[PDB]
CSV table of C-alpha atoms in Angstrom, one decimal:
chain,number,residue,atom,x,y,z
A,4,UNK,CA,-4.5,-0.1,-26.1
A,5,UNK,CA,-6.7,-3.1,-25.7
A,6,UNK,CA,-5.2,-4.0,-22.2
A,7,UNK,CA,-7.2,-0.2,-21.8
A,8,UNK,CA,-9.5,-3.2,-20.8
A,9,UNK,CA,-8.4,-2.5,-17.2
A,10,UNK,CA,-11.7,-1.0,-17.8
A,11,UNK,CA,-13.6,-0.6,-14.7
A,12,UNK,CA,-17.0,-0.4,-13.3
A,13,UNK,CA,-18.0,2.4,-11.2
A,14,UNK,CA,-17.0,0.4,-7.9
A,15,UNK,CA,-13.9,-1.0,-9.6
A,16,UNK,CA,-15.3,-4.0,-10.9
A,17,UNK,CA,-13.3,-5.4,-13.8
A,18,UNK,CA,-14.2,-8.5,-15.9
A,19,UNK,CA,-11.8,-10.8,-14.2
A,20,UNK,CA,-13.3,-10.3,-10.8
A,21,UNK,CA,-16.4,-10.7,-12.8
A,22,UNK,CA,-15.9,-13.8,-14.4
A,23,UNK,CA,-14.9,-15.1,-10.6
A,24,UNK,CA,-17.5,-13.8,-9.2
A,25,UNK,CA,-19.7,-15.1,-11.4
A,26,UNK,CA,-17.6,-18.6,-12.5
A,27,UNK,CA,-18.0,-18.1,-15.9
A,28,UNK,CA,-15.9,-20.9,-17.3
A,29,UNK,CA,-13.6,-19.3,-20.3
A,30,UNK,CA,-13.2,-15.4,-19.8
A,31,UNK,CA,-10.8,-16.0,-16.9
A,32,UNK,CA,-8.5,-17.8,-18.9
A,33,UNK,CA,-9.2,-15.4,-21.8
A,34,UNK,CA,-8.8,-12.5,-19.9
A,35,UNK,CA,-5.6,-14.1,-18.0
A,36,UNK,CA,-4.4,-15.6,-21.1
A,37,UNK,CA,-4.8,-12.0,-22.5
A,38,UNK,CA,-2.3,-11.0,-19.9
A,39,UNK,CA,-5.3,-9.1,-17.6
A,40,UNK,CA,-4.0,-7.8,-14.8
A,41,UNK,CA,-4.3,-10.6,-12.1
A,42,UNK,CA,-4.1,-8.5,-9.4
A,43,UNK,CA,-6.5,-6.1,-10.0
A,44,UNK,CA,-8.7,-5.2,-7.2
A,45,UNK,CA,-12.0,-3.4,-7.0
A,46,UNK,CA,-12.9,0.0,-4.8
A,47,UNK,CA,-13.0,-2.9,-2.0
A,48,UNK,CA,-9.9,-3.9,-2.2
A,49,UNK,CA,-10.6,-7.3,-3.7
A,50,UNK,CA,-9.0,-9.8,-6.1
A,51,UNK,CA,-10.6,-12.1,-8.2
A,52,UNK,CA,-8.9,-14.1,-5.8
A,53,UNK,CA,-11.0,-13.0,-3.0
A,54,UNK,CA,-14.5,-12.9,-5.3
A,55,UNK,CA,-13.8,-15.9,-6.4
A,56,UNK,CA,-13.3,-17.7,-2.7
A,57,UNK,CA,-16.3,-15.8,-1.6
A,58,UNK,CA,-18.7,-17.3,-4.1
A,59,UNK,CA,-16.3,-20.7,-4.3
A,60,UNK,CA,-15.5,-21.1,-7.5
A,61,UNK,CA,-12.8,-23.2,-7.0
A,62,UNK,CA,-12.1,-23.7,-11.1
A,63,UNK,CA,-11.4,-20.1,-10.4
A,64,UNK,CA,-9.5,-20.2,-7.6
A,65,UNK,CA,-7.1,-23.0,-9.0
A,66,UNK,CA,-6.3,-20.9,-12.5
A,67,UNK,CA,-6.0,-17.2,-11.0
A,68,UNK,CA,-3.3,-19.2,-8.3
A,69,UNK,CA,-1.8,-21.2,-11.3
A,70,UNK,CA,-1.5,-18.2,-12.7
A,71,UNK,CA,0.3,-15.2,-10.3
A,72,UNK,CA,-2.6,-14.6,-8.2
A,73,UNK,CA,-1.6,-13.1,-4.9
A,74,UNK,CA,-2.5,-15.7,-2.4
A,75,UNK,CA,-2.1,-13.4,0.5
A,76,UNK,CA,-3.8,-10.5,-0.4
A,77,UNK,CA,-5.8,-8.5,1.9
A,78,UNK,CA,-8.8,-6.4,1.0
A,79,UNK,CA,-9.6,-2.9,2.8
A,80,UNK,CA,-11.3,-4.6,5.5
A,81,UNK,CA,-7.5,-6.5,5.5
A,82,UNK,CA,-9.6,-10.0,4.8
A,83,UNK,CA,-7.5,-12.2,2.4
A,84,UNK,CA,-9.3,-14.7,0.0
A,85,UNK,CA,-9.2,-17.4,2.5
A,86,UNK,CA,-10.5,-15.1,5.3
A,87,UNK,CA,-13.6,-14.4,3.0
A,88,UNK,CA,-14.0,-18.2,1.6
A,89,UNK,CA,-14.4,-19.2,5.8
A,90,UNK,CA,-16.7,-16.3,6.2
A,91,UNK,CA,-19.0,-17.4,3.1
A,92,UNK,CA,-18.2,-21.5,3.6
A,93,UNK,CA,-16.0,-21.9,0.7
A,94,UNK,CA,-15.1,-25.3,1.9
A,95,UNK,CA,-14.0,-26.8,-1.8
A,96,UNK,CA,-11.9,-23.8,-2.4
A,97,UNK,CA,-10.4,-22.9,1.3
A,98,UNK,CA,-9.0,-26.7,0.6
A,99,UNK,CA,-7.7,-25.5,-2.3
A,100,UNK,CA,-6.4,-21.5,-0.8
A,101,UNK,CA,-4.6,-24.0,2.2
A,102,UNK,CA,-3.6,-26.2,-0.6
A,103,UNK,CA,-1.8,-23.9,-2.1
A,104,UNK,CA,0.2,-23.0,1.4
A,105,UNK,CA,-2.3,-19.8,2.2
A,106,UNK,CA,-1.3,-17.6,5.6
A,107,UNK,CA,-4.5,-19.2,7.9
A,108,UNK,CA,-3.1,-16.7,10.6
A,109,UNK,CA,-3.6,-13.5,8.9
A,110,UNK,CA,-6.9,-11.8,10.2
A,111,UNK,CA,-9.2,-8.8,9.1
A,112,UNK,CA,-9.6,-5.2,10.6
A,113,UNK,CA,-11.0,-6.6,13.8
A,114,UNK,CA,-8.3,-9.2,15.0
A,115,UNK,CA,-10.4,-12.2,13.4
A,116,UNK,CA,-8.6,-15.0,12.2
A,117,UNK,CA,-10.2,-16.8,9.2
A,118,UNK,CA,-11.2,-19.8,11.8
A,119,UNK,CA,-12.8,-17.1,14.0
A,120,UNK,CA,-15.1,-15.8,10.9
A,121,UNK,CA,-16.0,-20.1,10.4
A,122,UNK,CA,-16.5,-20.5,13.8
A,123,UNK,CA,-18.5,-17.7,14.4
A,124,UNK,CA,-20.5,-18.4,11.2
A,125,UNK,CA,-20.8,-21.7,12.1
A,126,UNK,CA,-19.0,-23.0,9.0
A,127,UNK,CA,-17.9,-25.7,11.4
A,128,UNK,CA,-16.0,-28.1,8.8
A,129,UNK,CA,-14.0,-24.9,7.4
A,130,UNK,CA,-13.0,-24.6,11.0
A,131,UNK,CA,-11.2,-28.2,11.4
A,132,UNK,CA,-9.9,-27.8,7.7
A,133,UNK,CA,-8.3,-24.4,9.5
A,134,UNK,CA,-6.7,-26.5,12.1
């Protein structure tokens, strides 16, 4: 009952999204190697996936992909990881999201497309690598 360690924080943090979130190094490939559920999300709807482009932690990024990581998933507000990493800047690891073949053309609750977010934010080189 040690996968029990689905274990949550109040806002559905787990220690996956955690360990993106905060790019610590090893506990993603622990908990991954420990067979964590890669797709977990918090209250937010987000992946590690999505914490992960938000704060750029590319490392990150490349291992949850490598290892079943939905590329395309969208969060409540229907913002996938790349959609977030434009948003934020994550130049380094939008490269890698498009890299990887990520949908550029999905966009979030309010018809945005993830170049809209860059654009608008002024994240002008995460524009171009859009385009």
């Amino acid at each position: 009952r040690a996968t029990d360690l689905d274990a949550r924080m109040h806002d559905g943090t787990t220690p996956l999204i955690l360990a993106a979130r905060l790019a610590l190094e090893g506990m993603l490939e622990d908990l991954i190697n420990s067979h964590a559920d890669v797709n977990a999300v918090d209250d937010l709807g987000k992946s590690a996936l999505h914490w992960a482009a938000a704060v750029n932690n590319v490392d990150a990024a490349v291992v949850l992909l490598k290892n079943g990581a939905n590329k395309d998933m969208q969060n409540n507000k229907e913002e996938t990881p790349l959609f977030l990493a434009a948003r934020e800047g994550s130049y380094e690891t939008a490269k890698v999201l498009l890299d990887h073949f990520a949908n550029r053309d999905i966009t979030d609750h309010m018809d945005r497309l993830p170049r809209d977010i860059a654009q608008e934010r002024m994240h002008h080189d995460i524009v171009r690598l859009l385009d």
